[PDB]
Amino acid sequence: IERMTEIALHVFRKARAGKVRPAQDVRGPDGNVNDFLEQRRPFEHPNPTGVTH
Amino acid sequence: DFAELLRPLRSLSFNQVVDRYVLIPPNHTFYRNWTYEKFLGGFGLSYLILRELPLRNFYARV
Numbered sequence: 809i810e811r812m813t814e815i816a817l818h819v820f821r822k823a824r825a826g827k828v829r830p831a832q833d834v835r836g837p838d839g840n841v842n843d844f845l846e847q848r849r850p851f852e853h854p855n856p857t858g859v860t861h
Numbered sequence: 862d863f864a865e866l867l868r869p870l871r872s873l874s875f876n877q878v879v880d881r882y883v884l885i886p887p888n889h890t891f892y893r894n895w896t897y898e899k900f901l902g903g904f905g906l907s908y909l910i911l912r913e914l915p916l917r918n919f920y921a922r923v
């Protein structure tokens with residue numbers, strides 16, 4: 809049952825990572841947080857653009 | 862033009878002038894300061910509508 813379990817968990821992790829879920833863990837692969845606020849320098853974004861007609 | 866300032870006085874007699882412009886019946890019940898309240902209070906009401914401008918940039922609304 810140990811081997812049966814790690815087969816399902818390997819499929820569950822791959823499926824969970826495939827979904828577009830909100831970030832649950834604090835830190836991603838790096839030590840940095842996975843929030844929208846975690847945008848530091850370098851500054852490379854221009855002014856926000858308006859709506860299109 | 863100096864004679865135009867006295868136009869409404871020529872059609873009237875003196876007793877009619879006093880009863881018209883001098884002897885206004887006392888009525889101290891009106892809200893006279895509503896003129897200032899609507900004008901100055903409009904700054905606050907204008908801010909309610911102005912704070913919802915769809916301007917995309919935050920510094921443009923600054």
Ligand SMILES: CCCCCCCCCCCCCCCCCC(=O)OC[C@H](COP(=O)([O-])OCC(O)COP(=O)([O-])OC[C@@H](COC(=O)CCCCCCCCCCCCCCCCC)OC(=O)CCCCCCCCCCCCCCCCC)OC(=O)CCCCCCCCCCCCCCCCC
Pocket residue numbers: 899900901902903904906907910
């Ligand atoms: C059906 C679809 C539409 C079809 C129709 C389309 C056509 C529509 C137009 C015709 C119908 C209009 C109806 C009213 C008739 C008025 C006609 C007129 O000529 O008025 C000119 C009017 C007044 O002229 P004014 O003598 O120069 O007074 C302004 C001075 O600044 C004043 O400065 P002040 O120093 O002399 O005095 C200070 C002032 C304070 O004033 C200020 O401080 C504001 C100054 C502006 C910001 C300062 C920066 C200056 C910016 C300069 C550049 C601006 C250029 C814009 C040019 C636009 C040209 C139109 O305080 C006051 O004087 C008193 C204010 C409080 C009195 C009560 C006001 C009640 C208003 C109505 C309430 C009910 C409406 C519902 C609430 C809103 C909806 C949620 O000028 C304006 O355009 C005012 C704009 C204010 C924002 C309006 C936003 C709401 C618009 C309502 C639209 C309908 C409701 C939404 C429907 C949504 C679905 C469609």
Ligand SMILES: CCCCCCCC/C=C/CCCCCCCC(=O)OC[C@H](COP(=O)(O)OCCN)OC(=O)CCCCCCC/C=C/CCCCCCCC
Pocket residue numbers: 890891892893895
């Ligand atoms: C659903 C109703 C809710 C009403 C609010 C609930 C609270 C009720 C408690 C009220 C208790 C009444 C006590 C007496 C209050 C006295 C009111 C008063 O002094 O008004 C004076 C005075 C009358 O003027 P005069 O003719 O010079 O004075 C004559 C005096 N006999 O009134 C005014 O100045 C007019 C201003 C009235 C208040 C402001 C009205 C505007 C409020 C904004 C909301 C309206 C939205 C829609 C407006 C349409 C615009 C296009």
